[PDB]
């Protein structure tokens, strides 16, 4: 028997995707030599298995390249040589993914996986399929798109503390539609910490912090006045600031408009993209626990704001109930939990 050479590509192939390595296998014989070079004769790094049967590229293959593969196999029956030339995908566009939360971080039970591309994704289904989420303990979750560029993944209920989450965004070499391919892969891994849920009840004007079911803090608060009420619903804790200038125009409202503002505040924890913060409000300590006076923020005392800053982490939960407001939009950016599971699970990959 004469040796046979089999590749993971074929001679003359076009549109070969670079999301996977290229390999060669010998039958009835072993691989004596394999080389692969690009257009300019530059070799691609590769590795032959110890038994001589399988060779594979070991470095990233490039877009828009023509590669030439030369392989020789020898057996007791003689020799065989093949030359294969193929071309890889030629993207019209590249998009780079950006993932949250950060690698190595410990986050709260409300924290979604977020993947944000720097370009509109025409094929949402292809993006979803290329994102590999591993959970331990395993739990079911689903993708939901907040806009044309950012997709979210979460389970049905808040994470169980101590859960490992691994996010492999394997977009390199993947056609995301209309000739748009991933610029690169990105990876992140994070862990779920303590269950921290702070409930603001407008009926009592108390913000209660519960850590793993236990009441550890009770904060008198002043929320949005009737004309600018705090929306009810579930909020995810985002970033924390020792101090920050809260500029209303960041959130769509002109500073000079009647509901506009620009205020320097201390110990500020953001809980919506719409501009809701828990923060130090020295000017309303008298109203806190009693009447709503703010633009929608949860006013608390200086010491309580700093407490909150010190004890609350990204992905922890603030729930607001019984205000005269509506419900925080599910696609706020930090309002993902306000979308019912059936709707979330169904997705909008369209």
UniProtKB/Swiss-Prot annotation:
GO terms for molecular function: acyltransferase activity; metal ion binding; peptidoglycan L,D-transpeptidase activity. Pathway: Cell wall biogenesis; peptidoglycan biosynthesis. The active site is at 279 (proton donor/acceptor), 297 (nucleophile). The keyword Cytoplasm does not apply. Its EC number is 2.3.2.-. Is irreversibly inactivated by the beta-lactams carbapenems via the formation of a covalent adduct resulting from acylation of the catalytic Cys; imipenem is the most efficient drug for in vitro LdtMt2 inactivation. Gene3D superfamilies: 2.60.40.3710, 2.60.40.3780, L,D-transpeptidase catalytic domain-like. Consists of two tandem immunoglobulin-like Big_5 domains in the N-terminal region (residues 56-145 and 150-250), followed by a L,D-transpeptidase catalytic domain (residues 251-378) and a C-terminal tail (residues 379-408). Generates 3->3 cross-links in peptidoglycan, catalyzing the cleavage of the mDap(3)-D-Ala(4) bond of a tetrapeptide donor stem and the formation of a bond between the carbonyl of mDap(3) of the donor stem and the side chain of mDap(3) of the acceptor stem. Is specific for donor substrates containing a stem tetrapeptide since it cannot use pentapeptide stems. This is L,D-transpeptidase 2. It comes from Mycobacterium tuberculosis (strain ATCC 25618 / H37Rv). The lineage of its organism: Bacteria, Bacillati, Actinomycetota, Actinomycetes, Mycobacteriales. The gene is ldtB.
């Amino acid at each position: 028997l004469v040796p046979k050479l089999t590749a993971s590509v074929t001679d003359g192939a076009v549109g070969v995707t670079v999301d996977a390595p290229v390999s060669v296998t010998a039958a009835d014989g072993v691989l004596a030599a394999v080389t692969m070079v690009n257009d300019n004769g530059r070799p691609v790094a590769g590795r032959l298995s110890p038994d001589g049967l399988r060779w594979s590229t070991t470095e990233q293959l490039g877009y828009n390249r023509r590669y030439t593969l030369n392989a020789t196999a020898l057996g007791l029956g003689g020799a065989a040589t093949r030359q294969l030339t193929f071309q890889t995908s030629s993207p019209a566009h590249l998009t780079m993914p950006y993932v949250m939360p950060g690698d190595g971080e410990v986050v709260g039970v409300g924290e979604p996986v977020a993947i944000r591309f720097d370009e509109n994704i025409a094929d949402r289904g292809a993006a979803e399929k290329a994102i590999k989420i591993t959970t331990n303990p395993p739990v079911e979750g689903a993708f939901y798109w907040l806009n044309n560029r950012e997709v979210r993944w979460r389970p049905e209920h808040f994470w169980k503390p101590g859960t490992a989450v691994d996010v492999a965004v394997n977009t390199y070499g993947v056609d995301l539609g209309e000739g748009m391919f991933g610029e690169d892969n990105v990876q992140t891994h994070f862990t779920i910490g303590d269950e921290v849920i702070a409930t603001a009840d407008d009926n009592t004007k108390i913000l209660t912090v519960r850590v793993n079911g236990e009441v550890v803090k009770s904060m008198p608060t002043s929320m949005g006045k009737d004309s600018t009420p705090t929306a009810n619903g579930i909020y995810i804790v985002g970033s924390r600031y020792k101090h920050i200038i809260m500029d209303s125009s960041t959130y769509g409202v002109p500073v000079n408009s009647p509901n506009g503002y620009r205020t320097d505040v201390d110990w500020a924890t953001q809980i919506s993209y719409s501009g809701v913060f828990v923060h130090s409000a020295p000017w309303s300590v008298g109203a806190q626990g009693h009447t709503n006076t703010s633009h929608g923020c949860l006013n608390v005392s200086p010491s309580n704001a700093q407490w909150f800053y010190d004890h609350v982490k990204r992905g922890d939960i603030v729930e607001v109930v019984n205000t005269v407001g509506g419900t925080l939009p599910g696609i706020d950016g930090l309002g993902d939990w306000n979308i019912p599971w059936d709707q979330w699970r169904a997705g909008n990959a369209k």
